[PDB]
Design a protein around this ligand. Structure first.
Ligand SMILES: [Mg+2]
Ligand SMILES: [Mg+2]
Ligand SMILES: [Mg+2]
Ligand SMILES: [Mg+2]
Ligand SMILES: [Mg+2]
Ligand SMILES: [Mg+2]
Ligand SMILES: [Mg+2]
Ligand SMILES: [Mg+2]
Ligand SMILES: [Mg+2]
Ligand SMILES: [Mg+2]
Ligand SMILES: [Mg+2]
Ligand SMILES: [Mg+2]
Ligand SMILES: [Mg+2]
Ligand SMILES: [Mg+2]
Ligand SMILES: [Mg+2]
Ligand SMILES: [Mg+2]
Ligand SMILES: [Mg+2]
Ligand SMILES: [Mg+2]
Ligand SMILES: [Mg+2]
Ligand SMILES: [Zn+2]
Lengths: 137, 115, 47, 76, 176, 190
RNA sequence: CCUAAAGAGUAACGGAGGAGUACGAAGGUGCGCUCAGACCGGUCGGAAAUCGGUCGCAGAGUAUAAAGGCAAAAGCGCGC
RNA sequence: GCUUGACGAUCAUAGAGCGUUGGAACCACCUGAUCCCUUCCCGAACUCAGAAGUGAAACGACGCAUCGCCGAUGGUAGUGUGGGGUCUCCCCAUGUGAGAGUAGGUCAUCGUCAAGC
């Protein structure tokens, strides 16, 4: 479960998630990547659970990159608690995801073996995903 | 050099006050051989009157001591009058007001113009 | 140099037992007799 | 909750903009520190307030070294 | 004195030993500063004037006390506390001190075959160390407090330490 | 064959460009370089995308037929939709016989199965960069820089300075005092 | 200080910190000077004291929170 | 018309780095501390009296884009007004329009006065 070692502030506002990803949308390191097509946010329990499913399938050589870091704290107000009286305590960490963002990368394996490995990871994530290779530009 | 760049910073406070007030400025410059004096009009753009030990009546050889500055200081006062200037400010340009520059100023006071 | 805050500083003389005299102005106020100098030191000559 | 505090707002900012007619003694900019520096015909208060010493027009020019911003008064 | 010795023959010989072209670029020695860092006297304050009183005799010039630039409690000091004294010697005073150092006191300290020639910084300045002050004259052995470690520094207009060593090869420095 | 057909574009802006992609199936483009003013053109989407699956698309010179005129250009930059990936805008750099030009050239790794660090010590290859920035006259622009890793011991690092470029080709990054690693051999992950 | 939507203003048992003093010099003026830090050499201290040199330009400082300022330094020293 | 010095306009397209180069005059270094003045010590700095030396350093001039700094066109993001949708978000008509990146540029341009050439 990824989270920052320390933060300047404990809490954050909900904010909004708009636009597309013109930054972080290319295959920078590996040769095949899993891209995001819908927007949403990954909760650092899905990111871990999709990494376990991906490396277990290959389990022979290869290298794997994670390109998403969950660094936005979210809170929940405990049960049977009225409205108000402060802001709730931090529960888990999430990463904001925009269409076009690259999530995982891999190399050192076959082109086909990458497809079964990313299909196992894509089933644990709450958004639509796509498979892309690396182009010169 | 460090010596010259430190002095040019010593001269900034007085030169930036004479512009806020917008007054005529009498600027003195000293070197190891000669001493100079200028009258700067109102904002730095123009020079009205000037004198130094380089003119063809002080080229004699004792051009770098106290009594060489006295002749220059009272010489610019004569030339200042022809320009119809009076009530100027003195600008030591960062040099200490003690020696040659003080003799050049003290001649200008008796030379006719008032600070 | 300031005035009246430093020790008196004077020419004096120095003599070494090796038959050596060197002029050196200092603050002894009294000539002194030496025993070893650069003319007679072992590790200045090669011992 | 251990947070509910704030302070009254001080109403700082540019009072007269560029091209406007000023009278002597008018207050031009209210500041903390010197975000605008005093130019021609402009004085500085003891809390970094820019006021007018002459009459004319607000200028709002940036010039010189250090890349400062100057408020001055020019003839109307 | 050594001042005459320098400009009469040291300069012309050193001009050719380095293939120098201009007489202005020949290396020269500018100032000598000694100091002595008194880690003690934090709880005494009484040896400071003893340390001061010692150092006019050695140099013929009044020293001045230096204070702590910072607190740092590991050494149990506070900012603005007297930590050491220093002197600066220039022109004729340093030359006569230099003669008084080469052979009045240096040969007779206790020991040593010489001085190391690797004690040069990158810009041709040499600094050495003195364990016991009593190596100097005008401080007799029967009226002193605990022995204290004076320090010596040389500042030269030498661009690098190669010719700075050559200059200190003149003045006949005992280099090993 | 590296041929493109383009027509002169007169209507500019966001509203006019969004119409080209939506209705006509075209793509806006720019032709700058040489000593001439930039010219705005448009070209078919299915034709620019057909040229882009050649390996040496960006490392080879193209003859862009604009209307009835012809000229020699090279793909400089390329804009793509972040999610869908199709090309949205492309700009060409004109080619002059006496003028240096920079380009991105892919790397071919050869005889990997012959690598010493793999058969003997059981290592693994990891390409770090698959392209380089070059600077050469257009007469000797290479299609690909061939990097050889037959004689690479386990744990060896291959830098820019270790490979060979053709006649009159510079590696740019190497010239700027920064020779970043190309590939390596490392022990298996686990 | 943020919320606060690039003039001002703007709420919640919204998110974060401080105050209920200090100073006869820590005020005025004239004159003078630049920091933190890194590295090299140097007697005991030694990663870090005092010293010399090079680099650096504000990463220092500002009686006291944070924001906005600071070369005519608003920072540091001395005389009156 | 050129060189030097002083004062300004303008604050990197004007800066940094590298190389060459100037001493007849100016400038700097320079010689000395009697005298004016000075150092919480010291003629280092400040000051004074000068004329044997040297352009070594500093400074000025002339070169190079290596770093820095400027920087299009085109496209993209955002956005006021009116209208839509599958409405946590986007699309259409109209007006507006960056930031970053690319082609490329830059080793400045002026005014007054004084001595010379
Ligand atoms: Mg909310
Ligand atoms: Mg972004
Ligand atoms: Mg001042
Ligand atoms: Mg609150
Ligand atoms: Mg609060
Ligand atoms: Mg409020
Ligand atoms: Mg006031
Ligand atoms: Mg529109
Ligand atoms: Mg508003
Ligand atoms: Mg507001
Ligand atoms: Mg209300
Ligand atoms: Mg409280
Ligand atoms: Mg204060
Ligand atoms: Mg130090
Ligand atoms: Mg200043
Ligand atoms: Mg001198
Ligand atoms: Mg545009
Ligand atoms: Mg636009
Ligand atoms: Mg732009
Ligand atoms: Zn002897």
């Amino acid at each position: 479960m990824l989270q920052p070692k320390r933060t300047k502030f404990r809490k954050q506002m909900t904010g909004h998630n708009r636009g597309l990803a013109h930054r972080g949308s290319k295959v920078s390191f590996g040769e095949y990547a899993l891209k995001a097509t819908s927007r949403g946010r990954l909760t650092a329990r899905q990111i871990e659970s999709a990494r376990r499913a991906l490396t277990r399938h290959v389990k022979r050589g290869g290298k794997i990159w994670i390109r998403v870091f969950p660094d936005k704290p979210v809170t929940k107000k405990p049960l049977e608690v009225r409205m108000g009286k402060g802001k709730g305590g931090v529960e888990y960490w999430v990463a904001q995801i925009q269409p076009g963002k690259v999530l995982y990368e891999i190399e050192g394996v076959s082109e086909e073996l990458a497809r079964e490995a990313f299909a196992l990871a894509a089933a644990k994530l709450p958004l639509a995903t796509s498979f892309v290779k690396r182009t010169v530009m | 050099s460090v010596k010259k760049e430190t002095r040019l910073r010593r001269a900034r406070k007085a030169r930036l006050k004479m512009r806020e007030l917008e007054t005529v400025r009498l600027c003195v410059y000293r070197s190891s051989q000669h001493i100079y004096a200028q009258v700067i009009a109102a904002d730095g753009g123009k020079v009205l009157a000037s004198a130094s030990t380089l003119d063809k009546d002080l080229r004699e050889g004792a051009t770098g001591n106290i009594d060489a500055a006295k002749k220059v200081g009272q010489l610019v006062a004569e030339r200042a009058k022809a320009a119809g200037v009076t009530q100027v400010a003195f600008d030591r340009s960062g040099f200490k007001y003690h020696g040659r520059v003080k003799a050049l100023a003290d001649a200008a006071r008796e030379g006719g113009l008032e600070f | 140099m300031k005035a009246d805050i430093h020790p008196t500083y004077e020419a004096i003389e120095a003599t070494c037992s090796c038959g050596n005299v060197i002029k050196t102005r200092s603050t002894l106020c009294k000539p002194i007799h030496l025993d070893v100098c650069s003319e007679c030191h072992p590790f200045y000559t090669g011992k | 909750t251990r947070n509910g505090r704030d302070s009254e707002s001080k109403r700082l900012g540019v009072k007269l903009f560029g091209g406007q007619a000023v009278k002597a003694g008018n207050i031009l900019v209210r500041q903390r520190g010197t975000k605008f520096h005093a130019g021609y015909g402009v004085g500085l208060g003891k809390d970094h307030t820019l006021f007018a010493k002459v009459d004319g027009v607000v200028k709002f020019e940036t010039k010189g070294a250090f890349g400062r911003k100057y408020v001055s008064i020019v003839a109307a | 004195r050594l001042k005459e010795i320098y400009r009469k023959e040291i300069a012309p010989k050193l001009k050719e030993e380095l293939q120098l072209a201009n007489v202005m670029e020949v290396p020269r020695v500018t100032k000598i500063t000694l100091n002595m860092g008194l880690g003690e006297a934090v709880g005494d304050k009484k040896i400071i004037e003893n340390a001061v009183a010692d150092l006019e005799k050695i140099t013929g010039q009044k020293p001045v006390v230096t204070y702590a630039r910072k607190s740092i409690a590991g050494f149990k000091i506070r900012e603005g506390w007297p930590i050491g004294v220093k002197v600066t010697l220039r022109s004729d005073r340093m030359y006569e001190f230099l003669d008084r150092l080469l052979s009045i006191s240096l040969p007779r300290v206790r020991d040593f075959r010489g001085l190391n020639a690797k004690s040069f910084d990158g810009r041709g300045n040499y600094s050495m160390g003195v364990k016991e002050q009593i190596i100097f004259p005008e401080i007799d052995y029967d009226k002193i407090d605990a022995l204290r470690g004076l320090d010596i520094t040389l500042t030269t207009t030498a661009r690098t330490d190669d010719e700075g060593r050559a200059l200190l090869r003149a003045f006949k420095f005992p280099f090993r | 064959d590296f041929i493109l057909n383009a027509q002169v574009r007169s209507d500019l802006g966001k509203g006019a460009s969004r119409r080209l992609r939506r209705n006509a199936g075209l793509v806006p483009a720019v032709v700058y370089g040489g000593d001439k003013e930039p010219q705005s053109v448009t070209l078919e989407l299915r034709e620019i995308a057909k040229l882009l699956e050649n390996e040496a698309a960006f490392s080879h010179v193209i003859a862009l037929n604009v209307g009835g005129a012809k000229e020699t250009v090279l793909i400089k930059a390329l804009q793509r939709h972040p999610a869908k990936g199709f090309v949205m805008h492309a700009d060409f750099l004109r080619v002059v016989a006496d003028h240096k030009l920079t380009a991105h050239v892919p790397l071919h790794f050869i005889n990997e199965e012959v690598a010493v660090g793999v058969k003997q010590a059981g290592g693994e290859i990891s390409h770090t960069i698959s392209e380089v920035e070059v600077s050469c006259l257009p007469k000797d622009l290479p299609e690909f820089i061939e990097v050889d890793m037959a004689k690479v011991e386990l744990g060896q690092i291959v830098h820019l300075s270790d490979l060979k470029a053709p006649k009159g080709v510079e590696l740019v990054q190497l010239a700027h005092g920064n020779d970043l690693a190309v590939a390596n051999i490392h022990a298996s992950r686990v």
